[PDB]
Amino acid sequence: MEAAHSKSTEECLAYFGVSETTGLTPDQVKRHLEKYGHNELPAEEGKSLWELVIEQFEDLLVRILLLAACISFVLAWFEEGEETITAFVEPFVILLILIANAIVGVWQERNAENAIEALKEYEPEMGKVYRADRKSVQRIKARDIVPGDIVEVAVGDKVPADIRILSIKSTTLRVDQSILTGESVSVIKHTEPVPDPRAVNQDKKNMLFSGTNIAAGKALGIVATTGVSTEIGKIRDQMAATEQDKTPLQQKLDEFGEQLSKVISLICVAVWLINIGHFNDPVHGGSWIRGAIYYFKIAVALAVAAIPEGLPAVITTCLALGTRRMAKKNAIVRSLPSVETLGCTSVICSDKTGTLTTNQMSVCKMFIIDKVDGDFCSLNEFSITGSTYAPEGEVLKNDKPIRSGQFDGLVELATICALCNDSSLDFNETKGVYEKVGEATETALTTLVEKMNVFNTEVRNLSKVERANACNSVIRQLMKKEFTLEFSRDRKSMSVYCSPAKSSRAAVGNKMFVKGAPEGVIDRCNYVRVGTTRVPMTGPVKEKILSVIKEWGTGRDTLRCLALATRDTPPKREEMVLDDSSRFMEYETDLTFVGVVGMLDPPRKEVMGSIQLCRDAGIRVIMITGDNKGTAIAICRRIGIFGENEEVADRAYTGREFDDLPLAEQREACRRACCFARVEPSHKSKIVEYLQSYDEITAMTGDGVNDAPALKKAEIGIAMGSGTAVAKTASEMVLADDNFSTIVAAVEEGRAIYNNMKQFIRYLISSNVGEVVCIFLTAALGLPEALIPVQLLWVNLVTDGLPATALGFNPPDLDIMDRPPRSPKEPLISGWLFFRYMAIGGYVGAATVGAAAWWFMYAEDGPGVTYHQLTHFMQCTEDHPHFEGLDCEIFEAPEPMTMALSVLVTIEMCNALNSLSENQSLMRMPPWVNIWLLGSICLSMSLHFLILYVDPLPMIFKLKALDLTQWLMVLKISLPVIGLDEILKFIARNYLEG
Ligand SMILES: Nc1ncnc2c1ncn2[C@@H]1O[C@H](COP(=O)(O)OP(N)(=O)O)[C@@H](O)[C@H]1O
Ligand SMILES: [Ca+2]
Ligand SMILES: [Ca+2]
Ligand SMILES: [Ca+2]
Ligand SMILES: [K+]
Numbered sequence: 001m002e003a004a005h006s007k008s009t010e011e012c013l014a015y016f017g018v019s020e021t022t023g024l025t026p027d028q029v030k031r032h033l034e035k036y037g038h039n040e041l042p043a044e045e046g047k048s049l050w051e052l053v054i055e056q057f058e059d060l061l062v063r064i065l066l067l068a069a070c071i072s073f074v075l076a077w078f079e080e081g082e083e084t085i086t087a088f089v090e091p092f093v094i095l096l097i098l099i100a101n102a103i104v105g106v107w108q109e110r111n112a113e114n115a116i117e118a119l120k121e122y123e124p125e126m127g128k129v130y131r132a133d134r135k136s137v138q139r140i141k142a143r144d145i146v147p148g149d150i151v152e153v154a155v156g157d158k159v160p161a162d163i164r165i166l167s168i169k170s171t172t173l174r175v176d177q178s179i180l181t182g183e184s185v186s187v188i189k190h191t192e193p194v195p196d197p198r199a200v201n202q203d204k205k206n207m208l209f210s211g212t213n214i215a216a217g218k219a220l221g222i223v224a225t226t227g228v229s230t231e232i233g234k235i236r237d238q239m240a241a242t243e244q245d246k247t248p249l250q251q252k253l254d255e256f257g258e259q260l261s262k263v264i265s266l267i268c269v270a271v272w273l274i275n276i277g278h279f280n281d282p283v284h285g286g287s288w289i290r291g292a293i294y295y296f297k298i299a300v301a302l303a304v305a306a307i308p309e310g311l312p313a314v315i316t317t318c319l320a321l322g323t324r325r326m327a328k329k330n331a332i333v334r335s336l337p338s339v340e341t342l343g344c345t346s347v348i349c350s351d352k353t354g355t356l357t358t359n360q361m362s363v364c365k366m367f368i369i370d371k372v373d374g375d376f377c378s379l380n381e382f383s384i385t386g387s388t389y390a391p392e393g394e395v396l397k398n399d400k401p402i403r404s405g406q407f408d409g410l411v412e413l414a415t416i417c418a419l420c421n422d423s424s425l426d427f428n429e430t431k432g433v434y435e436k437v438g439e440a441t442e443t444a445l446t447t448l449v450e451k452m453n454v455f456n457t458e459v460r461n462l463s464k465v466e467r468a469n470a471c472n473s474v475i476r477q478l479m480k481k482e483f484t485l486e487f488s489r490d491r492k493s494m495s496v497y498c499s500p501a502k503s504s505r506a507a508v509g510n511k512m513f514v515k516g517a518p519e520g521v522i523d524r525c526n527y528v529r530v531g532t533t534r535v536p537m538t539g540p541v542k543e544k545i546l547s548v549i550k551e552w553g554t555g556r557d558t559l560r561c562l563a564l565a566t567r568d569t570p571p572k573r574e575e576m577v578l579d580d581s582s583r584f585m586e587y588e589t590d591l592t593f594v595g596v597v598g599m600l601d602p603p604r605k606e607v608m609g610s611i612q613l614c615r616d617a618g619i620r621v622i623m624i625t626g627d628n629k630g631t632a633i634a635i636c637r638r639i640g641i642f643g644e645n646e647e648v649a650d651r652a653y654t655g656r657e658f659d660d661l662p663l664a665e666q667r668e669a670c671r672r673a674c675c676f677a678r679v680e681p682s683h684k685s686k687i688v689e690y691l692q693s694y695d696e697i698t699a700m701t702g703d704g705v706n707d708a709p710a711l712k713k714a715e716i717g718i719a720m721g722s723g724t725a726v727a728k729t730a731s732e733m734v735l736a737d738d739n740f741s742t743i744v745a746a747v748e749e750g751r752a753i754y755n756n757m758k759q760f761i762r763y764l765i766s767s768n769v770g771e772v773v774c775i776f777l778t779a780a781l782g783l784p785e786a787l788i789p790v791q792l793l794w795v796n797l798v799t800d801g802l803p804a805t806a807l808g809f810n811p812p813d814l815d816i817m818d819r820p821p822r823s824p825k826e827p828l829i830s831g832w833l834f835f836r837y838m839a840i841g842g843y844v845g846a847a848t849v850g851a852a853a854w855w856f857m858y859a860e861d862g863p864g865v866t867y868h869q870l871t872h873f874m875q876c877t878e879d880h881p882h883f884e885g886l887d888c889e890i891f892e893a894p895e896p897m898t899m900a901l902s903v904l905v906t907i908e909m910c911n912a913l914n915s916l917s918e919n920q921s922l923m924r925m926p927p928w929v930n931i932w933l934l935g936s937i938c939l940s941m942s943l944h945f946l947i948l949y950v951d952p953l954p955m956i957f958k959l960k961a962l963d964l965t966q967w968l969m970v971l972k973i974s975l976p977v978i979g980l981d982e983i984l985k986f987i988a989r990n991y992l993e994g
Helices: 009-016 026-036 050-054 061-074 086-120 248-274 292-306 311-328 338-343 352-356 408-419 440-452 470-478 518-523 539-554 581-587 605-616 629-639 655-660 663-672 681-692 708-713 725-729 741-781 789-799 802-807 831-847 849-856 894-911 931-949 952-956 966-974 976-989
Strands: 126-130 138-141 150-154 162-168 174-176 213-216 218-225 331-333 347-350 362-373 376-384 395-397 424-428 433-437 479-488 493-500 511-516 525-530 533-536 560-567 591-600 620-624 652-654 675-677 698-702 716-720 733-735
Touching (some): 050 086, 061 248, 061 292, 061 311, 086 311, 086 952, 150 162, 213 725, 248 741, 311 331, 311 338, 311 741, 311 802, 338 733, 347 352, 347 681, 352 620, 376 539, 408 440, 408 470, 408 525, 408 560, 408 591, 440 470, 440 560, 440 591, 479 511, 518 539, 605 620, 620 629, 620 681, 629 675, 655 663, 655 681, 663 681, 675 681, 681 698, 681 708, 708 716, 733 741, 741 802, 741 831, 789 931, 802 931, 831 849, 831 894, 894 931, 894 976, 931 952
Parallel strands (some): 347 698, 525 591
Antiparallel strands (some): 126 138, 126 150, 331 733, 376 395, 479 493, 493 511, 511 560, 560 591
């Protein structure tokens, strides 16, 4: 732990006692651990209090039912009667459903938090350090790094600790530190000290803060602080719900229930009005108050009844549930909307190298010049063996194992590979395998030279550790790397300025070794090295080279090709300005071509398959790579993006070709084209932006820093577990699995959550509308009431709860991933659905009245008021308007009423069997598809039985009943709801639109 960033490199180096180039001794490490602990934070625990999670109150339509319970608790406090209890049950028929939803939500959210922390804490964060026990850089669990030791970090890496920069390898080091200082753009660094021991972070321009990202370049430094003593480790705890808000679908439904408060609140105040004429009726005596409170009670209870108090929970739930599922497919969701947004995606843009392909690169072919004579050019081709980055394998000409150092071309070739190279290898002892350190393209090279072994170095007697870099090291001892012109994606090449090693001879030849994309480099070559010789680059020579490149690119191996050339006579260091990266290309001119390497880079298994599924789901998949257009197109084909034979000149463009088009033509180009090549980061962004200008939901997949902009501009960015931190930081989802499939599953889930939301809404609406059709039909048809306050609270508690919340666990529709994606601005409720909402609610409203009616009329154990209702109800006093006054006051019988309440429950528990699927028959999507649903129904049906037979209970509600017949009736009335929907589903099916 150093308190200084205001000291020099040495002071700091000596402070811990380290060799800036070698790193801490196994004993210094064992010690600093003991003295400084591991590089991490305690945390890892409770991200939400068991009680916090409970605040699945505080929402919209939950506060309503919350308050409706208060009033029914005050009214019960001011209620005098020998019936001082049916009023205390009320507040618990309301609280009850609220509680039930609360638990499920809470349960679902806890399981998700867990599942996630599982995925996260799975793959350990690794670090790059120089340590004494190894000559080359090695990778250690970041948790293990301690103050003092030497850390290396480069473009795209995440700073693993708080670090004092020692040496900046690239011409410039650019770091992104938004997570800390809040500075929006990348900032510059230097190795000079900053005196002021008070200075703020923003000014510590010689430090790298653990948790920032390197946006550009590469550097080595010495670790000042670890763990909690970290600039970002202190500030963790400190508040701010910087955790976003609600998802667009969450905000869509939030508003739908808001204006359902209106429609409902009105229909309520309505009931209070449509009656209040029964303000005097003998029932509540006739008081100038006892009649408006009863009906005020019927309103509130009708409200609680209609209001989908489960809506705010079920989204939340489906959400956390979708999350938990992705988490299980090794997908990390960084931003809640992602899965939903993903659901309705039309276009999936994707990087090639490393995203579409495995990024496991090996050099397997290479070539130099053989003979150059007039229009004749010939090449020395070679083959390499070994698919991994292991330094085991052999070079082969004509199937014969050749000794690389035998060909002068291959010597320089190797020299260049070794020297123009920011990456290295490292052998993982635990896993027992050679792992790259830096970019794969570069590392492939490193491996190549370990296989070339041109100076026939003795290696057979070297540990699996030393054998990794041995040769390269040799080459490294042979020249001094003065500085390097970092690889830049515009010029698409990279160079290295070198002088003679021991300084044996000064001015005997300074060099620049160059490595880059063939086309550009070859254009910058004036000469062609022939062994030790050199001759002018000519037409025929070039053509020969390029043509073999073309061959290898489009070949059945789709080789990823790089060119190596040297500048024999560089400018003097004094003439070279390293300030503007722009002038580097010139510094890389008048080159001498040396040779070409063909890299192997396998497409991922699951990719072709995922592409298909997208094609069926109506989803466009576009490739946006920096790589060569020929190679790229080749690969699209292998990936299924293009047919093995197919003219693509109209649908595949290079950044250059693309930029040549007029703006208009660019916009359109995006619509038809599926392959963009040799494109800079800006292009990747622009292409998405275009897709977006068609009001479409665009997805961007990638792994590298040239992907960030597009990753960031898309609706969802999906990063690779393998890819850069930079790339991850700009993503909503991260495939740790690196599995491409998950993307598709991810779109299937958001398709589903939506469908689930719909059916929920369908059941709540069509049912609860029936419930209000019940009332506004009897009270208007001049019929005796069908339900009382606590009778409504019951049809509620028992059909607006777990049976509904259960729809959340509906399976995917059978066609879900077979129809085009939903426009995001689509009317939540279609016109044709409102009809179906009504046609169901209507039939529910009436079948519930005709049942109470039927009890009055055709019930063989009831009276027989036959058709007409015998006209009316106005037959109070004995033999009143004598129209067969053979009965007294059967107009208070608890039977006609429980008759309806019983049907309501049942007919509702029926069209919830209709909310398995939008438009699929129970013949295709049967009830057992959703088991969680069935248990809920039985749960409710059971609650209804209890209420009807546990003697103390029918008092508090209404008189029991039904033995066969009476129940068989409820059934005869309710069951047809299923027949009506199953025809209604027939309609919208054998006439389609969605
Ligand atoms: N580290 C590097 N140094 C020099 N040249 C390199 C390099 N890594 C990549 N190249 C060349 O730059 C070209 C474009 O790189 P880029 O757009 O970043 O990704 P990609 N799919 O093309 O590899 C590559 O196709 C490659 O030939
Ligand atoms: Ca309700
Ligand atoms: Ca890439
Ligand atoms: Ca209901
Ligand atoms: K984004």
